[PDB]
Paper text:
In Bacillus subtilis tryptophan biosynthesis is regulated by two proteins, the trp RNA-binding attenuation protein (TRAP) and Anti-TRAP (AT), which are involved in sensing levels of free tryptophan and uncharged tryptophanyl transfer RNA (tRNATrp), respectively. AT antagonises TRAP action by binding to tryptophan-activated TRAP and preventing its interaction with the leader region of the trp mRNA. Binding of zinc ion is essential for formation of AT oligomers and for its function. Here, we report two crystal structures of Bacillus licheniformis AT, which shares 66% sequence identity with B. subtilis AT.
The low-pH crystals belong to the space group H3 with four AT monomers per asymmetric unit whereas the high-pH crystals belong to the space group P21 and contain 48 AT monomers in the asymmetric part. Packing of the trimer and the additional AT subunit around the crystallographic 3-fold axis generates four AT trimers that form a dodecameric particle. The architecture of this dodecamer is identical to the one observed for B. subtilis AT at pH 6.5. As with B. subtilis AT, trimer–trimer association within the B. licheniformis dodecamer is maintained mainly by hydrophobic interactions in two regions. The first is a hydrophobic area in the centre of the molecule, lined by residues 1–3 from all 12 AT monomers. The second region of stabilising interactions includes van der Waals contacts between pairs of adjacent zinc-binding domains formed along the 2-fold molecular axes by residues Pro13 and Ile35. An interesting feature of the low-pH dodecamer is the relatively large internal chamber inside the multimeric assembly, which is centred at the intersection of symmetry axes and is isolated from the solvent. There are no peaks in the electron density maps inside the chamber suggesting that it is filled by disordered crystallisation buffer components or solvent. Its inner surface is lined by the side chains of twelve Val2 residues, this amino acid is strictly conserved in AT proteins. The chamber could be fitted with a sphere of ∼11 Å in diameter, potentially permitting the accommodation of a relatively large ligand. The calculated pKa value for the amino group of Met1 is 7.1. This indicates that the salt bridge formation is favoured in case of the low-pH crystal form (pH 6.0) as the amino group of Met1 is likely to be protonated.
Residue numbers in the entry:
A (entry chain D), B (entry chain D), C (entry chain A), D (entry chain D), E (entry chain A), F (entry chain C), ...: 1 to 53
The structure:
C-alpha cells in the first residue's frame, strides 16, 4: 500500500515498543510504544484540524 | 490522487453496495455498502489509535 | 513495492478468506477467498482484454 | 512524504489564509484559512464515514 | 495516473467553478474556475520559468 | 488509483471507440477501439512472457 | 522517474513513429509520431489552461 | 513509468541474459534469461489467480 | 508533493544562484541560476513538443 | 521527491534532535538526533549488506 | 513502504538462502543468498559512485 | 522504477558528461560527469549519516 502502518509510526526507541519505563509509562511515546513519523503526524493533524467543521 | 475513495474501500460483494440483506442490514459491510481495503483499515486504525492522545 | 497483493484484492468478507461456502466455492469471491480492489479489477480487466495480443 | 499538508489543503484564495473577511470570518474557508484539495476531502470523508462503526 | 487534474487544481471556492463573478472573470481563480494546488503551482511555475528553453 | 485504465490504454486515433472501419474491423486497434500505452504494453509483454501461457 | 516520456506519449498507431502518411505529415499525430497518453493530456491541458497564451 | 520491465524481472544470475546453460535452456530462468522480482511475482500471481485458466 | 521544484531543477554548479558570471550572464544556466533535471528536462521537452507552441 | 529525509528518519524523541544526552551522544539515536523509519532502515540495511560489491 | 527489501534484492535462484554451495560459498550471490534487482543495483551503484568511498 | 539513476544525478552542465575540464577532472562534478539531484543528495546524505564511516 501507498501508506502502511510503518510509514505512519515507528517503534519508540526508549521503551522499544513496551510503552513502559518502569514503574511509569514511557514518557517518549506516552505509553503507546510507537512514535509518529512526519507522515503520520501530517495525517493526524489534518484529520483533527477538520474533523469537526 | 495518491489515495482515492476506491483505494480505501470497495463495494461489498454481499449486498453489491445496498447495505441490505433484506429484511436486515447487510452483515458483511454492516450496513455501509462497502468494505475496507487493507489501506483503508490501516488509515482508519491509525487515526483511531492516536486521535485522542 | 508499488502495487502489493493487498493493493489488488482483500479478504472476502463472506467466507473470511477460506474461498468456501460448503459444499461450494464461495460465490462472492468465486472460491478465491479474496475480492478485487478497483486497482485489481482494473489490472485483471486490462490483461484479459488484450491477452491474445 | 507521500501526502504532505500541501497535498491535503491549500491557502484560501479569498482571505489568502487569514480566515477573515472583515468584520466576519471568511466564508470560503469558513475561518480556517485553507480549503481542502480533492485528496484532503477524500481522506476526511473516509475517516468521518467509518470512525464510529 | 500519478498526477491527475485534481492533484493540480481544485474548484475555486469563490465562484464554485463557474470562473465568473459577473460581469467579470472571477478574480480569485482568474476566470479559470479552479485554484492551483501546491503541486499545480510548482509545475506551472517550472514550465513558465523555462518555457523559452 | 496509481494505475488506471487510461494509463494502460489510450483511445485509438484511427477510430475513436467503434473499434471498426466499415465494413470490416478497425486495423490499428484490431476492433478493441483502444491502443496500448508504454505502461500497458509493458505489463502485457511481462504477463505474456511469464504466464508461460 | 515519476513521469517519464513514456508516461506522456505513445508511438502513434497510424505512422508508427515517423508521424508521416505520405506525402503528408501523419494526420493522427501531426507528424510528431506520438500520441498523448491520458497523463500527457492531463499535464498539457493543465499547462495550456494557466500558462497565459 | 510506475512499473517498468526492470521492476518486474531481473537478469538471471545463472546464465546472465541468455537463459542458457548449454546445451539446455537455463534451468533457473527457463531460458528466458530473467528471473522475477517480488513485484513481478505479485502481479503474475495475481493475474494467474483470477485470469481463469 | 511527488514532484517538487528541486526535483525539476537543481541549483547551477557554475554559479549557485546569482545566475551570473561577472560582468555578463551565467553561461551554464543562462542567468536562471538553476539547471534542469532528467525529470524537469523530460517535462519541459514534452510540453514544448505539444503545446504546439 | 519520492523519498525525502522525513521519509527516512524522524527527530529522536529522547534528545528531541540534539543527538546528545550529556556528556554522551544520545544512546537512542546514536548521537544522530534522528531515529530511522522502516523505509530508512530498509535502505541503510541494503546498502550496508552490499557495500563491498 | 515504497521501497521494501524485496524490491531491492530477490532471493538467489542458484541456492535459496543458505548462501552456500557445499563445501564452499555460493558463486551467484557470493554467500549473501540474495541477488540485486534493477532498483537495488541502481541504488547501490549510485551510493558507491558518490560516497566517494 | 521508483528511483532511477536519472532521479539521482544529472549530466554535469560544465563538462557535459566527461567530467573533464582539460587537463583536469571537471571541478563541478569531480570528473564523474554528473551532479546530484535533490533526491540523490537526500539519499546519499542519509547513507553517509548512518553508514558508520
Ligand atoms: Zn516509548
Ligand atoms: Zn454489504
Ligand atoms: Zn468468499
Ligand atoms: Zn478564507
Ligand atoms: Zn473563481
Ligand atoms: Zn481503431
Ligand atoms: Zn502518426
Ligand atoms: Zn538464467
Ligand atoms: Zn549558472
Ligand atoms: Zn536522540
Ligand atoms: Zn546463491
Ligand atoms: Zn562536470
Amino acid at each position: 500500500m501507498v501508506i502502511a502502518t510503518d510509514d505512519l509510526e515507528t517503534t519508540c526507541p526508549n521503551c522499544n515498543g513496551s510503552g513502559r519505563e518502569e514503574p511509569e509509562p514511557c514518557p517518549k511515546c506516552l505509553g503507546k510504544g510507537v512514535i509518529l513519523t512526519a507522515q503520520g503526524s501530517t495525517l493526524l493533524h489534518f484529520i483533527k484540524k477538520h474533523i469537526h467543521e
